[PDB]
Amino acid sequence: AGPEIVKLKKILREKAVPPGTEVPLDVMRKGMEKVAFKAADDIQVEQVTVAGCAAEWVRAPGCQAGKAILYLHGGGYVMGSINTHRSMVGEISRASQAAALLLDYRLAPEHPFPAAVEDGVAAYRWLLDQGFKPQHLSISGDSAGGGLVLAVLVSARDQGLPMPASAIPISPWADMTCTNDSFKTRAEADPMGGINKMAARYLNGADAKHPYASPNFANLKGLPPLLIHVGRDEVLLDDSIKLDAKAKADGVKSTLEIWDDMIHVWHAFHPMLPEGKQAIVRVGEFMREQWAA
Template sequence: MEETPIEKLQRILREKATDPRAPMQVAERRELMEKMSFKVKDDITVETVQAAGLEAEWLRAPGAQKDRAILYFHGGGYVIGSPNTHRALGGEISRTSQASVLMPDYRLAPEAPFPAAVEDGVSGYRWLLDQGFTPAQIAIGGDSAGGGLVVATLVSARDQGLAMPRAAVCISPWSDMTCSNESYRTRDAADPMVKHAGITQMAALYLNGADPKDPLASPNFADLTGLPPVLIHVGSDETLHDDAIALDRKAKADGVQSTLEVWDKMVHVWHAFHPILPEGKEGIERVGEFLCQQWAA
């Protein structure tokens, strides 16, 4: 029987996987992720800028509206990843949302541990405001660690007295640094990408001794009152499944308009595999639909 696209992707990911129990070689992991990146589509405009002292990229698809901006945080466990590794994904989000995507190269651990990424996230948001965007013209999105960083940035920005953006999107968010939810164990075998042993190493590098329940490290423990409407995507087979479930539950308990969508059999951040996975394209289209609805409301 012929493999489905998701079955083929899962097999390939398992074949390429390294032993998650081995000590993390940060430089090698960064290099590997850079090599595995998809190429951005030719019609996406890429503009390098300095945003609040950070290297960043504006990604604009044809038709992107100049008065809509998405501040997007790439994934990679706060240790690996860059605008280069997520440029293709950001470009397609620009296309479906009809907005310009700003992707900052925020500081990574272990060189810059917690709370450096959160500080950079808020700085990126302030920079957009300084460029003349109103909060209502801005959305914040991210995947994996970037998905957790979305919520941490919003909490920190709110606590600093900044007005909230129009909407937020969290794709496969890592939002609990305790790494203790049930799915870390029950879905460890099913998830070909995120393993409990490996993600706990990343958590230790990022936290650098900080409390894993700090609300800006693990926003599942934060007061989310006043945050904007949020779309949360997670795959049913993900190790981070329960992080997303808990984030949605906490958001709703704090009065936030949260939309949780659990996609059947999908891998971690399946949207990033859109060149080879139909569901990846569908996930990006859903993100764009959600954001356009929020901007039109």
């Protein structure tokens, strides 16, 4: 249906390491840093520290005064940084006209679970304490960071925190047991097991069904409206279908949208992918929808 994903899928295929090759952690970290998209030049950035983590407010133009996004990057809980996700987050800020807080939360295996959860709740709390009003808040995250979105919500709700206006997990990883069908069914279509070594590194012997590690098994009752993006052609399809089905069950509003022909966090390829640009427009549409209500 699209000539851009075809071009892009072949590119990501030519580029990937053979299946089942063991790449050092420091080697995958730097590689992700080395190939990271550069933020559009009209995105301004301000470095802060938030709950003892490095952070940047990432403000595109048009940003409105009351509003913010706690944004939680992907990387399997072991890699990714402010730098690797600054581009896509600039675009989410554009679309939603709210500044992103882009948190450099603690990474495994130097800092195992629940460290990353502990940072998310703390950044959220820090936002409220700055006097952002929950109803002026959004939370969003890709992949590992999309499960964290949820984990932080459940966690913050257990702690007495008010829920934000919406939550957008993009290609969420919300099940550390990695047993879902799509790992097998959808695996010839991901250009893109290696993800088990990251559960092992995050968990570090913890219960893999621990609600805050794998939020597909958490009590979700009370959480605010969900938009969940995932690509049909990606390993983690099931996580998103089961997140939505569990949200449903637990009283929560979600819109799952499986985008056909798309790969993992296709949003990140906005610079060359039309679906990427439009999925980002749609995220910002959805946070702006939840803010008007």
